[PDB]
Design a protein around this ligand. Structure first.
Ligand SMILES: O=C(c1ccco1)N1CCN(C(=O)C2CC2)CC1
Length: 171
């Protein structure tokens, strides 16, 4: 059985208990904390690509009002984010299981851009999600995993200074 776990969940949970925020810029900003995934139960000899996307956790716009995040009253349907291919992809199961799969080079943007960067909507709440795609083999297979612990609101600047402080303390 394929097992997927979050590395450094301890630290993600500190961010989550304050409501996590991730900066988006026109050129695109790397994530802190970085999503790192523990994977076991792959076929060491089979070929796989690791994909990352962001699910809109709800259909609302959020605003930091008097020291607290509060949703708008006018939901709109969100639509899927684009997919980021882990740059090690494609690769052997052995490669992926030898150390945590680290998405350190994904950049989050607010503007439709050349390539690589993933465009999110500012002030929407997102749940990171990976897909492990068995490729090259006869039977293509996908396994998906969500990381509730890694939820964040996309922001053009930090609103909760408690988040600013945690980001600096641990980077
Ligand atoms: O690992 C995969 C893959 C397998 C299944 C879905 O994607 N690929 C896709 C295409 N590739 C590219 O062209 C580079 C990105 C520009 C990178 C390798």
């Amino acid at each position: 059985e394929l097992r997927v776990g979050l590395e450094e969940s301890e630290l993600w949970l500190r961010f989550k208990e304050l409501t996590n925020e991730m900066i988006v810029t026109k050129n695109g900003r790397r994530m802190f904390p970085v999503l790192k995934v523990n994977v076991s139960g792959l076929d060491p000899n089979a070929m796989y690509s690791f994909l990352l996307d962001f699910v809109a956790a709800d259909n609302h716009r959020w605003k930091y009002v008097n020291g607290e995040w509060v949703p708008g009253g006018k939901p709109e349907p969100q639509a899927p984010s684009c997919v980021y291919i882990h740059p090690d992809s494609p690769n052997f199961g052995a490669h992926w299981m030898k150390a945590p799969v680290s998405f350190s080079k994904v950049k989050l943007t607010n503007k439709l851009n050349g390539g690589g960067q993933i465009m999110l909507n500012s002030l929407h709440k997102y749940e990171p999600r990976i897909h492990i795609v068995r490729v090259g083999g006869p039977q293509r297979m996908i396994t998906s995993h969500c990381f509730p612990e890694t939820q964040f609101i996309a922001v053009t600047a930090y609103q909760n200074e408690e988040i600013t402080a945690l980001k600096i303390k641990y980077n």
